[PDB]
Amino acid sequence: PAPHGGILQDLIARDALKKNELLSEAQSSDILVWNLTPRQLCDIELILNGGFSPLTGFLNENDYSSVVTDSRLADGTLWTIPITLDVDEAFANQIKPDTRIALFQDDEIPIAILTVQDVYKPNKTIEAEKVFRGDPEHPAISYLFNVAGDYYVGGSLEAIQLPQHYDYPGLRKTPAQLRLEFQSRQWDRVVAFQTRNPMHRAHRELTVRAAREANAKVLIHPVVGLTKPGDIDHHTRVRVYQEIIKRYPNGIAFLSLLPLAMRMSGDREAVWHAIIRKNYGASHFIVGRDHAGPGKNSKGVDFYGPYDAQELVESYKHELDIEVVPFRMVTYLPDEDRYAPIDQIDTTKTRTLNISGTELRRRLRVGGEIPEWFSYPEVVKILRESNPPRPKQGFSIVLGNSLTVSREQLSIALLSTFLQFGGGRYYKIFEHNNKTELLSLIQDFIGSGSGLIIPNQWEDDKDSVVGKQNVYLLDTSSSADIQLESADEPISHIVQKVVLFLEDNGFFVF
Amino acid sequence: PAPHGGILQDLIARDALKKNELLSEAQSSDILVWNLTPRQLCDIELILNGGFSPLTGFLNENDYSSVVTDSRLADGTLWTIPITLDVDEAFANQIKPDTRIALFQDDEIPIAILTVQDVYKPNKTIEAEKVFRGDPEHPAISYLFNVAGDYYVGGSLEAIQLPQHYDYPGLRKTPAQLRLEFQSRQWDRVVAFQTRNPMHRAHRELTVRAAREANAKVLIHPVVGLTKPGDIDHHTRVRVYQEIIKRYPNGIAFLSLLPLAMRMSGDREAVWHAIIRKNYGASHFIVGRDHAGPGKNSKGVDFYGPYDAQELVESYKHELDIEVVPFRMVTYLPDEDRYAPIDQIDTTKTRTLNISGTELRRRLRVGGEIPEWFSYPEVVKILRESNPPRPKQGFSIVLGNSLTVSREQLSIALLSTFLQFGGGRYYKIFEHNNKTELLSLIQDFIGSGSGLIIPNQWEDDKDSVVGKQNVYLLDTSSSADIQLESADEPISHIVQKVVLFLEDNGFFVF
Amino acid sequence: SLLPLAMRMSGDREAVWHAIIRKNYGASHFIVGRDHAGPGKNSKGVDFYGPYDAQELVESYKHELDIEVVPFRMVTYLPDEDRYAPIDQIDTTKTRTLNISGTELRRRLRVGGEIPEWFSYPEVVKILRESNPPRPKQGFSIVLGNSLTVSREQLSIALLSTFLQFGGGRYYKIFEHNNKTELLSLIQDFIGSGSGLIIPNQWEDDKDSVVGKQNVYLLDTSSSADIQLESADEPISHIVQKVVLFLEDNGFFVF
């Protein structure tokens, strides 16, 4: 269907003949520069390539306010997620309306020139409540307060070039490009599938049934910008998509990556996804259970109800101009060797099997088997590689502050001991000297599968620098992972405690 | 047989009742301390545990000189390798005869008290020529000049404790201990096998035949102190020995580790090995082809003739007091599915197969198959782990000084590109800032299998800090591993050059 | 169909006889092979019959045998073509051919080695391996020679305890025959059963015939001993080693 607002605002194409001129202005000595944050790069790419039609810049306060309370742009155009350029006070003060500023990437690549319409300090409590529902634990609110700038700069954009990406150049289709790809194949009915996760047999099955019921071709449009915190990296995920797309019948599916920065804003985001896919050329879209929802908070309560998304999108059905296909999740029937829509089988009368994310995570952590009815083997092989089991995981042993035995000798004892065991893990007694440049290397070593022995703890005002994954404290204190019987426990006893701890946790296997 | 000189100089046992007294003296405030170098720890352990009977300390000049020219101690006792305590001038000056000094390990563990008999500056050109044959490339001469102190301190030793080791506590038998292990099994004929390498089927076969011909039990006595430069680490090797010892018929073999510091001094060392094994309780010993020889020098010439060792040991036969079993190397006969002594088959009349070290190294580098007739599978599995093939090897790409493209962008491009590929290798753009504390981490990352992208070169006065294995220079210069067409070559072209280079070299496999 | 014939291995005469016999059983044709029904060569390595005596003799009686004799066209395997072809059709020096002699087949079976499907069908090879197991599965006997002055009761006990350490499932027995025929005749049955027997003393020479000599080894100082002792009073532990390593060299034990 036609782009939201009727026109594809592909600013790259619009400004093609001003590229040199704009590029030269961006590189002028007198122009004020702003370095785009990683989320802003995600947003500006979608504005510049028309992914966010009718947007043609970051929202000024007039539009922003309507989006916050009315879920629309001041002109009444449905638009549920505010896209603004958040800056700090120091920069906001240097700019006034009509000021033209340059937006760079990595402090070296000019992306666009923004003509300032306004500068304002939004009430983040209202946005937090109105747009994201108010739970301080909602990733969007966390970002809203802890990362986002306190001042929004609204203004019209002029394009120099889209944010630079060196990976998957072939798959990052812009709206215009994707539309031409469909057009060259004569596809005029396309159902799009959103995801920020690996795809298993069930996803393959459900998307194909969608294709069959909507009489449409399939578009697997995964998000590769910012997704939920803790999600699997997009490189791993792209590898999985590239693998699963080969499992569809020839000529029925197309894989294209979307550099979107999700807010995990549930029902509002679901609407936004529909609009965005319409701009990219899809005729149909599937909205899932708790679509774009971040789940439950600490108190175990739902950030959104499982059907809020589908209900909200349905309420805007008459103006979305993109058909929404009903979400029919499928489950595996052992006794019939097939998948079937969950709404068609009687739980208490028919056998069904499925592997929850929690269980999948466990199996991967212990190197256990994962059945082909759940996920294709080539897909599982990829997941095991990016997330190796414990015998292949790195780790660190931190000699606590309470230790009175010789740190130099205990570290040497641990090294010599670990080195006896096989498995190929690399070991290092690592001294950081409380230097940040060294502390930041700890998780890289662990990520590399290495075993580090750290002679002493770093200062508390440095915790933030070190990731806590697979990092274990050896100390007399109660908060120690490997508790010492006493501060002067004999080195050989300590060594045993560590070895058996690592064994119990799967790092060593004999 | 009886220890060389007639008495096992086990100083640990001799001084058992002075341990507290000696320990207290070593920890006195006024006593002069010397930190033992890694080779001296190897030597003192063998002196203290009687491994070097009749030695009871480091050689004074009187004995040392006789060993250098006469191959004997001043009393006429056969002794071919000088064992001295080499120190720098600053320390030598602080000591005079009768001075009692303490010998520590790791600057914290007291090993012994040495009563200085003399202090002298040896003519290292004579020792180099007389003891090690004079080739400046002989590892012993290299050490003699580049590492060893210029002053020898001769003196009698009193034991506090043997050098601390936390790995393989069970297998490091002292002479007295090994002798009791043989005695408890009623073994009175034992043939010992020396090695600083992995053991393959041929070694298993030849040692068993030795046992059969000498009517003796087998002692696999591998060196785990210092061996030849470039040798496989002893942890890997011990794993292999522990594995192969299980392939002998029950009750025929015993595995014990020897903390010797080899000099790779060919025929002289061969004699020394015989003496040492006699002290440890062996009745027989096998002297191999080019036994304890370092091979050929740069000009491709032999450091020693292949039979110098066997000939020298044979010339001392009447006073060694340990039988030397003839070395009968075996080779595999495909057509008969068996190994047979090489001196029994006609090369041109019978089929024989064998895998040279060079070829073994290749197969391991490319992950190729290695047949069970060559080495037991459990042994090969261990070698593959410590020395993984290229797809599992780490590496570094150094952005040369000639580069005029943006280093920050080229590094980012390489990262994003590498991250597309699968395989689980971990990647890092690593900035060392010419800091030693960071440069020394490069090979640890590579040893961990990681891929590092280094934005700029380090200063030449730092080369020594970084190992050169799997480190590749991207530069316009001729000495670059990955040569740029020009200093400003487009980033995408450079990326391709690197990817294809790494592929050609096996790091990436598609 | 099985024929309860008692062959005489009488070469060409027997070949004729086989033709007659098959005619009686109803065959219209018969193949006479190379050295058909021949026993091979004698000690001096000379042929009991010429390779074509049989075919020639049968051919000379062709007009009265009343059964057609089909020419014998032996086939060989062509690796490069994955097929068998008549040996009389290929040029030895121009075309690759593979084949496994009886001697080699026997070896492979004795050592448990692989035998390729181009030579014999796997189900056929499985059967041959069962009736003729490789050395690790073969029985054997160790006879303590008459020259031994060490204690026979202790050496036998030492050997037993030692063998019992090793795995593999072979059953062991210190077997006393007391020169009784009823016991001596059981030796090869035990060996045929895969068992390992330790025999404390030799039987009288007028009894040799009763015991098969397969896998029976003499431990003695004499020159004709399979496992030669350094001396009659060699220490028991040394003797044990000599035996273990001998059995290993010969494939009975594998570690």
Ligand SMILES: [Ca+2]
């Ligand atoms: Ca703030």
Ligand SMILES: [Ca+2]
């Ligand atoms: Ca719920």
Ligand SMILES: [Ca+2]
């Ligand atoms: Ca205490």
Ligand SMILES: [Ca+2]
């Ligand atoms: Ca010097």
Ligand SMILES: [Ca+2]
């Ligand atoms: Ca040579």
Ligand SMILES: [Ca+2]
């Ligand atoms: Ca240029």
Ligand SMILES: [Ca+2]
């Ligand atoms: Ca013949």
Ligand SMILES: [Ca+2]
């Ligand atoms: Ca005697």
Ligand SMILES: [Mg+2]
């Ligand atoms: Mg882009």
Ligand SMILES: [Mg+2]
């Ligand atoms: Mg020690």
Ligand code: NA
């Ligand atoms: Na429409």
Ligand code: NA
């Ligand atoms: Na999904």
Ligand code: NA
């Ligand atoms: Na709700």
Ligand code: NA
């Ligand atoms: Na002696």
Ligand code: NA
């Ligand atoms: Na060797």
Ligand code: NA
């Ligand atoms: Na020579």
